[PDB]
Amino acid sequence: XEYEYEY
Amino acid sequence: XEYEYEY
Amino acid sequence: XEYEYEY
Amino acid sequence: XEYEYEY
Amino acid sequence: XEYEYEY
Amino acid sequence: XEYEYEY
Amino acid sequence: XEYEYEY
Amino acid sequence: XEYEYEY
Amino acid sequence: XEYEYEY
Amino acid sequence: XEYEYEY
Amino acid sequence: XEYEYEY
Amino acid sequence: XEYEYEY
Amino acid sequence: XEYEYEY
Amino acid sequence: XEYEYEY
Amino acid sequence: XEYEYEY
Amino acid sequence: XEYEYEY
Amino acid sequence: XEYEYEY
Amino acid sequence: XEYEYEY
Amino acid sequence: XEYEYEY
Amino acid sequence: XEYEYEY
Amino acid sequence: XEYEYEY
Amino acid sequence: XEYEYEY
Amino acid sequence: XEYEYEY
Amino acid sequence: XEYEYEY
Amino acid sequence: XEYEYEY
Amino acid sequence: XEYEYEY
Amino acid sequence: XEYEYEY
Amino acid sequence: XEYEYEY
Amino acid sequence: XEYEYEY
Amino acid sequence: XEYEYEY
Amino acid sequence: XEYEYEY
Amino acid sequence: XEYEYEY
Amino acid sequence: XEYEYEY
Amino acid sequence: XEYEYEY
Amino acid sequence: XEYEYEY
Amino acid sequence: XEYEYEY
Amino acid sequence: XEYEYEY
Amino acid sequence: XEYEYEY
Amino acid sequence: XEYEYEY
Amino acid sequence: XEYEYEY
Amino acid sequence: XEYEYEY
Amino acid sequence: XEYEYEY
Amino acid sequence: XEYEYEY
Amino acid sequence: XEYEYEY
Amino acid sequence: XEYEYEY
Amino acid sequence: XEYEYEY
Amino acid sequence: XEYEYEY
Amino acid sequence: XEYEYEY
Amino acid sequence: XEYEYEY
Amino acid sequence: XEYEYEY
Amino acid sequence: XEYEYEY
Amino acid sequence: XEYEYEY
Amino acid sequence: XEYEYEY
Amino acid sequence: XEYEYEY
Amino acid sequence: XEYEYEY
Amino acid sequence: XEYEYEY
Amino acid sequence: XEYEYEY
Amino acid sequence: XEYEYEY
Amino acid sequence: XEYEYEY
Amino acid sequence: XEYEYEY
Amino acid sequence: XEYEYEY
Amino acid sequence: XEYEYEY
Amino acid sequence: XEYEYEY
Amino acid sequence: XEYEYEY
Amino acid sequence: XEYEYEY
Amino acid sequence: XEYEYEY
Amino acid sequence: XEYEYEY
Amino acid sequence: XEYEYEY
Amino acid sequence: XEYEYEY
Amino acid sequence: XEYEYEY
Amino acid sequence: XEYEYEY
Amino acid sequence: XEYEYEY
Amino acid sequence: XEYEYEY
Amino acid sequence: XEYEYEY
Amino acid sequence: XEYEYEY
Amino acid sequence: XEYEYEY
Amino acid sequence: XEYEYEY
Amino acid sequence: XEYEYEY
Amino acid sequence: XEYEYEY
Amino acid sequence: XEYEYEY
Amino acid sequence: XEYEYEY
Amino acid sequence: XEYEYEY
Amino acid sequence: XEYEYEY
Amino acid sequence: XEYEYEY
Amino acid sequence: XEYEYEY
Amino acid sequence: XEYEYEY
Amino acid sequence: XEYEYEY
Amino acid sequence: XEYEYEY
Amino acid sequence: XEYEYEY
Amino acid sequence: XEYEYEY
Amino acid sequence: XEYEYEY
Amino acid sequence: XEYEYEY
Amino acid sequence: XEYEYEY
Amino acid sequence: XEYEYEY
Amino acid sequence: XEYEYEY
Amino acid sequence: XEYEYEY
Amino acid sequence: XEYEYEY
Amino acid sequence: XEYEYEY
Amino acid sequence: XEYEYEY
Amino acid sequence: XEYEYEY
Amino acid sequence: XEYEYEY
Amino acid sequence: XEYEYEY
Amino acid sequence: XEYEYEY
Amino acid sequence: XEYEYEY
Amino acid sequence: XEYEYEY
Amino acid sequence: XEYEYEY
Amino acid sequence: XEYEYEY
Amino acid sequence: XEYEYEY
Amino acid sequence: XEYEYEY
Amino acid sequence: XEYEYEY
Amino acid sequence: XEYEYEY
Amino acid sequence: XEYEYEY
Amino acid sequence: XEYEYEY
Amino acid sequence: XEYEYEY
Amino acid sequence: XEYEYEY
Amino acid sequence: XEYEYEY
Amino acid sequence: XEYEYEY
Amino acid sequence: XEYEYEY
Amino acid sequence: XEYEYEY
Amino acid sequence: XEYEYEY
Amino acid sequence: XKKKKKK
Amino acid sequence: XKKKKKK
Amino acid sequence: XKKKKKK
Amino acid sequence: XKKKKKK
Amino acid sequence: XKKKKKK
Amino acid sequence: XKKKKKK
Amino acid sequence: XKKKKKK
Amino acid sequence: XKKKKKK
Amino acid sequence: XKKKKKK
Amino acid sequence: XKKKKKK
Amino acid sequence: XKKKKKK
Amino acid sequence: XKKKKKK
Amino acid sequence: XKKKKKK
Amino acid sequence: XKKKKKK
Amino acid sequence: XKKKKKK
Amino acid sequence: XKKKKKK
Amino acid sequence: XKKKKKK
Amino acid sequence: XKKKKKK
Amino acid sequence: XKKKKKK
Amino acid sequence: XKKKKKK
Amino acid sequence: XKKKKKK
Amino acid sequence: XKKKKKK
Amino acid sequence: XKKKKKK
Amino acid sequence: XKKKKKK
Amino acid sequence: XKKKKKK
Amino acid sequence: XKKKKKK
Amino acid sequence: XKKKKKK
Amino acid sequence: XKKKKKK
Amino acid sequence: XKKKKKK
Amino acid sequence: XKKKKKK
Amino acid sequence: XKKKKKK
Amino acid sequence: XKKKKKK
Amino acid sequence: XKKKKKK
Amino acid sequence: XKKKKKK
Amino acid sequence: XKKKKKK
Amino acid sequence: XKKKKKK
Amino acid sequence: XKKKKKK
Amino acid sequence: XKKKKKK
Amino acid sequence: XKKKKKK
Amino acid sequence: XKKKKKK
Amino acid sequence: XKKKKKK
Amino acid sequence: XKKKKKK
Amino acid sequence: XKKKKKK
Amino acid sequence: XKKKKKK
Amino acid sequence: XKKKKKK
Amino acid sequence: XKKKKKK
Amino acid sequence: XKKKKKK
Amino acid sequence: XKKKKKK
Amino acid sequence: XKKKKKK
Amino acid sequence: XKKKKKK
Amino acid sequence: XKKKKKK
Amino acid sequence: XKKKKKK
Amino acid sequence: XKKKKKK
Amino acid sequence: XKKKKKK
Amino acid sequence: XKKKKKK
Amino acid sequence: XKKKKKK
Amino acid sequence: XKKKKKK
Amino acid sequence: XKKKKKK
Amino acid sequence: XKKKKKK
Amino acid sequence: XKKKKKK
Amino acid sequence: XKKKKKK
Amino acid sequence: XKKKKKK
Amino acid sequence: XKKKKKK
Amino acid sequence: XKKKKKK
Amino acid sequence: XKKKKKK
Amino acid sequence: XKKKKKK
Amino acid sequence: XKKKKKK
Amino acid sequence: XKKKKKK
Amino acid sequence: XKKKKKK
Amino acid sequence: XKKKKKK
Amino acid sequence: XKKKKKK
Amino acid sequence: XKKKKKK
Amino acid sequence: XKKKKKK
Amino acid sequence: XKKKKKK
Amino acid sequence: XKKKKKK
Amino acid sequence: XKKKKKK
Amino acid sequence: XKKKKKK
Amino acid sequence: XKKKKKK
Amino acid sequence: XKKKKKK
Amino acid sequence: XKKKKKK
Amino acid sequence: XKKKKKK
Amino acid sequence: XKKKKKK
Amino acid sequence: XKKKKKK
Amino acid sequence: XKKKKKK
Amino acid sequence: XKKKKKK
Amino acid sequence: XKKKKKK
Amino acid sequence: XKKKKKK
Amino acid sequence: XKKKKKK
Amino acid sequence: XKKKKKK
Amino acid sequence: XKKKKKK
Amino acid sequence: XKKKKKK
Amino acid sequence: XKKKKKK
Amino acid sequence: XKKKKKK
Amino acid sequence: XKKKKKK
Amino acid sequence: XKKKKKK
Amino acid sequence: XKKKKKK
Amino acid sequence: XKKKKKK
Amino acid sequence: XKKKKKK
Amino acid sequence: XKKKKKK
Amino acid sequence: XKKKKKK
Amino acid sequence: XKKKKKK
Amino acid sequence: XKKKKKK
Amino acid sequence: XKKKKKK
Amino acid sequence: XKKKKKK
Amino acid sequence: XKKKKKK
Amino acid sequence: XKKKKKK
Amino acid sequence: XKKKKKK
Amino acid sequence: XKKKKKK
Amino acid sequence: XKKKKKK
Amino acid sequence: XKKKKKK
Amino acid sequence: XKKKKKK
Amino acid sequence: XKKKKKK
Amino acid sequence: XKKKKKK
Amino acid sequence: XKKKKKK
Amino acid sequence: XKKKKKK
Amino acid sequence: XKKKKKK
Amino acid sequence: XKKKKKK
Amino acid sequence: XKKKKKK
Amino acid sequence: XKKKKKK
Amino acid sequence: XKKKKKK
Are strands EU3-4 and EV3-4 parallel, antiparallel or unpaired? Predict the structure, then answer.
């Protein structure tokens, strides 16, 4: 899978 | 898969 | 899949 | 799939 | 699929 | 599918 | 499908 | 489908 | 379909 | 279809 | 269809 | 169709 | 159709 | 159709 | 059609 | 049609 | 049509 | 049509 | 039509 | 039409 | 039409 | 039409 | 029409 | 028409 | 028309 | 018309 | 018309 | 018309 | 018309 | 008319 | 008319 | 007319 | 007219 | 007229 | 007229 | 997998 | 896997 | 694996 | 593995 | 493994 | 392993 | 191993 | 091992 | 081992 | 081992 | 071992 | 060992 | 060991 | 050991 | 050991 | 050891 | 050891 | 040891 | 040891 | 040791 | 040791 | 040791 | 030792 | 030692 | 030692 | 009636 | 009636 | 009626 | 009626 | 009726 | 009725 | 009725 | 009715 | 009714 | 009714 | 009704 | 009604 | 109603 | 109603 | 209603 | 209604 | 309604 | 409604 | 409604 | 509604 | 509605 | 609605 | 709605 | 809606 | 909606 | 919507 | 929507 | 949407 | 969307 | 979207 | 999206 | 996306 | 994306 | 992406 | 990406 | 990426 | 990347 | 990368 | 890289 | 790299 | 690199 | 490098 | 390098 | 290098 | 280098 | 180098 | 070099 | 070099 | 070199 | 070199 | 060299 | 060289 | 060289 | 060389 | 060389 | 050389 | 050489 | 050489 | 050589 | 050589 | 009428 | 009528 | 009518 | 009518 | 009618 | 009608 | 019608 | 019708 | 019709 | 129709 | 129709 | 129809 | 139808 | 239808 | 239908 | 249908 | 249908 | 249908 | 359907 | 359907 | 359907 | 369906 | 369906 | 479905 | 479905 | 579905 | 589904 | 689904 | 799903 | 899913 | 999923 | 998923 | 997933 | 995943 | 994952 | 993962 | 992982 | 991992 | 890992 | 790891 | 590791 | 490790 | 380690 | 380690 | 270690 | 270690 | 260590 | 260590 | 260590 | 150590 | 150590 | 150490 | 150490 | 040490 | 040491 | 040491 | 040391 | 040392 | 040392 | 040392 | 009436 | 009436 | 009526 | 009526 | 009526 | 009515 | 009515 | 009505 | 009505 | 109505 | 209505 | 209505 | 209506 | 309506 | 409506 | 409506 | 509506 | 509507 | 609507 | 709507 | 709508 | 809508 | 919509 | 929509 | 939509 | 949408 | 969408 | 979408 | 989308 | 998407 | 996407 | 995507 | 993607 | 991607 | 990617 | 990638 | 990549 | 890469 | 790469 | 690479 | 590379 | 490379 | 390379 | 390379 | 290389 | 190489 | 190489 | 090489 | 080489 | 080589 | 070589 | 070589 | 070699 | 070698 | 060798 | 060798 | 060798 | 060797 | 060797 | 050797 921001 | 923001 | 905001 | 906001 | 707001 | 608000 | 508000 | 409010 | 209010 | 209020 | 109130 | 009130 | 009240 | 009251 | 009261 | 009361 | 009372 | 009372 | 009472 | 009483 | 009583 | 009593 | 009693 | 009694 | 009794 | 009794 | 009794 | 009895 | 008895 | 008895 | 008896 | 008996 | 008996 | 008996 | 018997 | 920002 | 920024 | 910035 | 900057 | 800058 | 700059 | 610059 | 510059 | 420059 | 320059 | 320049 | 230049 | 130049 | 030049 | 030039 | 030139 | 030139 | 030239 | 030339 | 030339 | 030439 | 030439 | 030539 | 030539 | 030639 | 002159 | 002149 | 002149 | 002149 | 001239 | 001239 | 001239 | 001329 | 000329 | 000429 | 000419 | 000419 | 000519 | 000519 | 010619 | 010619 | 010719 | 020719 | 020819 | 020819 | 020919 | 021929 | 031929 | 032939 | 032939 | 033949 | 033949 | 034959 | 035959 | 035969 | 046969 | 047969 | 047979 | 048979 | 049979 | 059979 | 059978 | 059978 | 069977 | 069976 | 069986 | 069985 | 069995 | 069994 | 068993 | 067993 | 067992 | 057992 | 056991 | 046991 | 035991 | 035991 | 025990 | 024990 | 014990 | 004990 | 003990 | 003890 | 003790 | 003790 | 004074 | 004075 | 004075 | 004065 | 003065 | 003066 | 003056 | 003056 | 003046 | 003047 | 003047 | 003037 | 003037 | 002038 | 002028 | 002028 | 002019 | 002019 | 002109 | 002109 | 002109 | 012209 | 012209 | 022209 | 022309 | 022309 | 033309 | 033309 | 033409 | 044409 | 045409 | 055409 | 056409 | 067309 | 077309 | 087309 | 097409 | 196409 | 195509 | 294609 | 293709 | 292809 | 292909 | 291919 | 292929 | 292939 | 292949 | 293959 | 193969 | 193969 | 193979 | 193989 | 094999 | 094999 | 094998 | 094998 | 084997 | 084996 | 074996 | 074995 | 034979 | 034989 | 035989 | 035989 | 035999 | 036998 | 036998 | 026998 | 027997 | 027997 | 027997 | 028996 | 028996 | 028996 | 019995 | 019995 | 019994 | 019984 | 009973 | 009973 | 009972 | 009962 | 009962 | 009951 | 009950 | 009940 | 109940 | 209930 | 219930 | 319930 | 429930 | 429930 | 539930 | 639930 | 749940 | 759950 | 859960 | 969980 | 969890 | 967890 | 965890 | 954890 | 942890 | 941790 | 940690 | 840590 | 740490 | 640390 | 550290 | 550190 | 450090 | 450091 | 440092 | 440092 | 440093 | 440094 | 430094 | 330095 | 330096 | 330096 995945396109992960943890913002 | 998925397009993940955790904002 | 999915287009995930967790806002 | 799905277009998921969890707002 | 679906277009999911959980508002 | 569906266009889901859970408001 | 359907156009679902659960209001 | 249908145009569903559950109000 | 149908145009459903459940009011 | 139909135009359904369940009022 | 029909134009249904269930009032 | 028909124009239905069930009043 | 018909114009139906069930009153 | 007809113009129906069931009164 | 007809103009029906069932009174 | 006819103009029907059933009174 | 006719003009019918059934009285 | 006719003008019918059934009285 | 005729002018009918059935009295 | 005729002017009918059936009395 | 005629003017009919059946009396 | 005629003027008819049947008496 | 005639003026008829049948008496 | 004539003036008829049948008496 | 004539003036008829049938008596 | 004539003046007729049939008596 | 004439003045007729048939007596 | 004449003045007729038939007696 | 004449004055007729037939007696 | 004449004055006629036929007697 | 004349004064006629036929007697 | 004349004064006639036929006797 | 004359005064006639035919006797 | 004359005074006539025919006797 | 004259005074006539025919006797 | 995944494309990870931890921002 | 993964493409890791820890920013 | 992985492509690691620790920025 | 990995491609490591520690920046 | 790894490609290590410690910058 | 590894390709080590310590810069 | 390793390819070591200590720069 | 290793390929050591100490620069 | 090793290939040592101490530069 | 080793290949030592001390430069 | 070793191949020693002390340069 | 060793191959010693002291240069 | 050793191969000693002292140069 | 050794092969000594002192140059 | 040794092979000594003192050059 | 030794092979001594003192050159 | 020794083989001595003093040259 | 020794083989002495003093040259 | 010794073999002495003094040359 | 000795073998002495003094040359 | 000795064998003495003094040459 | 000795064998003396004085040459 | 001695064997003396004085040559 | 001695054997003396004086040559 | 001695054996003396004086030659 | 009589033969009357009133003259 | 009579023969009346009133003259 | 009579024969009346009123002259 | 009578024979009336009123002249 | 009578024979009336009013002249 | 009578025979009336009014002349 | 009568025979009326009004002349 | 009567026989009326009004002339 | 009557026989009326109005002439 | 009557027989009317109005002439 | 009557028999009317208006001529 | 009547028999009307208006001529 | 009446029998009307208007001519 | 009436029988109308308007001619 | 009436029987109308307008001619 | 009426029976209308407009001719 | 009416029976209309407009001719 | 009416029975209309417009001819 | 009406029965319309427009012819 | 109406029954329309436009012919 | 209407029954329309446009012919 | 209507029943339309356009012919 | 309507029943349309365009023929 | 409508029932359309375009023929 | 509509039921369309375009024929 | 519509039911379309294009034939 | 629509139901389309293009035939 | 639509149901498309292109035939 | 659509249901497409291209036949 | 669409359901495509290209047949 | 689409469901594609190319047949 | 799409579901592709190329058949 | 797509689901590709090339058959 | 894609799911490729090349069959 | 892709899932490739080349069959 | 890809998942390659070449079968 | 890829997962390669060459079968 | 790749996972290579050559089978 | 690669994982090579050559089978 | 590679992991080579040659089987 | 490589891991070589030649089996 | 390499890890060589030749088996 | 290499790790050589020749087995 | 190498680690050689020849087994 | 090498580590040689010849076993 | 080498470490030689010949076993 | 070498370390030789010949075992 | 060498270290020779011949065992 | 060498260190020789012949054992 | 050499160090010789012959054991 | 040599150091010889012959043991 | 040599150092000889013959033991 | 030599140092000889013969032991 | 030599130093001889014969022991 | 020599130094001889014969022991 | 020699120094002889015969012991 | 010689120095002789015979001991 | 000689120096002789015979001891 | 000689110096003789015979001891 | 000689110097003789006989001791 | 006469006089007849009967009795 | 006469006089008949009967009784 | 006469006079008949009966009684 | 006569006079009949009965009684 | 006559006179009949009965009683 | 007559006169009948009964009673 | 007559006169009948009964009573 | 007559006159009947009953009572 | 007559006159009947009853009572 | 008559006149009936009852009472 | 008559006149009936009851009471 | 008549007139009935009751009361 | 009649007139009924009740009361 | 009649007129009924009740009261 | 009648007129009923009640009250 | 009638007129009913109640009150 | 009637007119009912109540009150 | 009627008119009901209540009040 | 009617008109109901209540109030 | 009716008109209801309430108030 | 009706018109309801309330107020 | 109706029109409801409330107020 | 209706029109509801509230206010 | 309706029109609701509220206000 | 409706139109809701609120305000 | 509707139109909601609020304001 | 709707149109919501708010404001 | 909707259009929401807010403002 | 919607269009939201806010402002 | 939507279009959101904000501003 | 959306289009968000902000500004 | 989206398009976000900010500005 | 997105397109973000910022500015 | 994205495209970010910043500026 | 991305494309970042900054500037 | 990315492409970063800075400038 | 990346491509960084700086400038 | 990267490509860094600086300039 | 990298390629660094500086300039 | 790298390639560094400087210039 | 590297290649450094400087210039 | 390196290759350094300077120039 | 290196290759240094200077020039 | 090195190769130094200077020039 | 080295090779130094100068020139 | 070295080879120095100067020139 | 060396080889020095000068020229 | 050396070989010095000068020229 | 040396060999010096000069020329 | 030496060999000096001059020429 | 020496050999000096001059020429 | 020496051998001097001159020529 | 010496041998001097001159020529 | 010497041998001098001159020639 | 000497031997002098001259020639 | 001497031998002088001249010739 | 001497022997002088001249010739 | 001497012997002088001349010839 | 002397012997002089001349010849 | 002397003996002089001449011949 | 009389005779009047005037002239 | 009379005779009047005028002329 | 009279006779009037005028002329 | 009279006789008037004019001319 | 009279006789008037004019001419 | 009279007789008028004109001409 | 009269007789008028004109001509 | 009369008789008018004109001609 | 009369008879008019014209011609 | 009359008879008019014209011709 | 009359009879008009024209011709 | 009349009879008109034309021809 | 009349009868018109034309021809 | 009439009868018109044309021909 | 009439009857028109044409032909 | 009429009857038209043409032919 | 009429009847038209053509032929 | 009519009946048209053509043929 | 009509009936058209053609043939 | 009509009936068209063709044939 | 009609019925068309063709054949 | 119609019925078309062809054949 | 119609019914088409062909055959 | 229709029914087409072909055959 | 239709029903097509072919056969 | 249709039903096609073929066969 | 359709149903196609083939066979 | 369809249902295709083939067979 | 379809259902294809083949067989 | 489809269901294909083959067999 | 499909379901293929073969068999 | 599919399900293929073969058998 | 698929599921292939073979058997 | 697939699942292949063979057997 | 796959799962292959063979057996 | 796969899982191969054989057996 | 694989898992091969054989057995 | 693999896991091979044999047994 | 592998894991081979045999047994 | 491997792990071989045999047993 | 390996680990071989036999047993 | 190896680890061989036998037992 | 090895470790051989036997037992 | 080895470690051989036997026992 | 070795370590042999026997026991 | 060795270490042999026996026991 | 050796160390032999026996015990 | 040796060290032999026995005990 | 040796050291033999016995005990 | 030796050292023999016995005890 | 020796040293023999006994005790 | 010797030293023999006994005790 | 000797030194014998006894005690 | 000797020194014998006894005590 | 001797020195004998006894005590 | 001797010196005998007794005490 | 002798010196005998007794005491 | 002698010197005997007794005391 | 002698000198005897007693005391 | 003698000198006897007693005291």
Answer: parallel
CB EH5 within 8 A of CB EF6: no
**With left for phi above 0 and alpha for psi between -120 and 50, is residue EL4 left, alpha or beta?**
beta
Rounded CA-CA distance AZ6/AY2 in Å is 13
Q: Which residue of AF has its CA nearest to AG3?
A: AF3
Instruction: Give the C-alpha separation, BX6 to BF2, whole Å.
Output: 197
EI4 near EJ7, Cβ under 8 Å? Answer: no
Distance CA GP3, CA GN4 (A): 11
CB AU6 within 8 A of CB AW6: no
Residues on HZ contacting IA at a C-beta cutoff of 8 Å: 2-7
Question: CA-to-CA distance for BG4 and BF3, rounded, in angstroms?
Answer: 7
CA distance FY2 to FH6: 203
Residues 6+ away with beta carbon under 8 Å from BO4: BN4, BN6, BP2, BP3, BP4, BP5
- What are the chain ED neighbours of EC3 within 8 Å (beta carbons)? 2-3, 5
| Side-chain-side CA neighbours of residue GI5 (13 Å) | 10
Those residues with Cβ within 8 angstroms of residue CV3's Cβ, 6 or more apart along the chain or in another chain: CU2, CU3, CU4, CW2, CW3
What technique solved it?
Answer: cryo-EM
Q: Is AL3 left (phi over 0), alpha (psi -120 to 50) or beta?
A: beta
Interface of CL with CM in 1-7 (CB under 8 A): 2-7
Contact criterion met (CB below 8 Å) for DE3 and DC5:
no
Q: Of the candidates FU7, BH4, CY2, which has an alpha carbon nearest to the alpha carbon of residue FV7?
A: FU7
**Residue BC3 pairs with which residues in a beta bridge?**
BB3, BD3
Q: Could you tell me which residues are beta bridge partners of residue CN4?
A: CM4, CO4
FI4 CA to centre of own chain:
1
Q: How far apart are the first and last CA of chain AJ?
A: 18
Q: Which of CK1, CF3, CI5, CM1 is nearest to GY2 (CA)?
A: CI5
Contact CF6/CD5 with Cβ under 8 angstroms? no
**Length of chain EH (residues):** 7
Q: Which residues of HB touch HC5 (CB under 8 A)?
A: 3-6
Looking at the complex, report in whole angstroms how far the Cα of residue BS3 sits from the nearest Cα belonging to chain BT. 5
| Token pair belonging to FS4 | 């002098």
Q: How far apart are CA AT7 and CA BF7, in angstroms?
A: 60
For residues DN5 and FC7, what is the distance between their CA atoms, to the nearest angstrom? 101
Give me the residue label for tokens 């890809």. CR2
β-partners of residue CA4 are BZ4, CB4
Sign of the torsion formed by the C-alpha atoms of DV6, DW3, DW5 and DX3: positive
Q: Identify the burial level of DJ7 via C-beta atoms within 10 angstroms of its C-beta, where 0-12 means exposed, 13-18 middle and 19 or more buried.
A: exposed
Residue BP2 has φ and ψ, to the nearest 5°, of -130, 170
In angstroms, the CA DN3 to CA FE2 distance is 83
Q: What is the CA radius of gyration of chain H?
A: 6
| Shortest Cα–Cα distance, AQ6 to chain AR (Å) | 5
Residue of BC nearest to BB3 (CA): BC3
Q: How many CB atoms lie within 10 A of CB HU2?
A: 13
Resolution of the experimental structure, in angstroms = 3.3
Residues of I in contact with J3 (CB under 8 A): 2-3
In 3-state terms, what secondary structure has residue S5? strand
Nearest to GF4 by CA among GC1, GG5, GD5: GG5
Strand, helix or coil for residue CS2 = coil
Distance between CA atoms of residues CA7 and GV3, nearest Å: 35
How many angstroms separate the CA atoms of HQ2 and DR7, rounded? 203
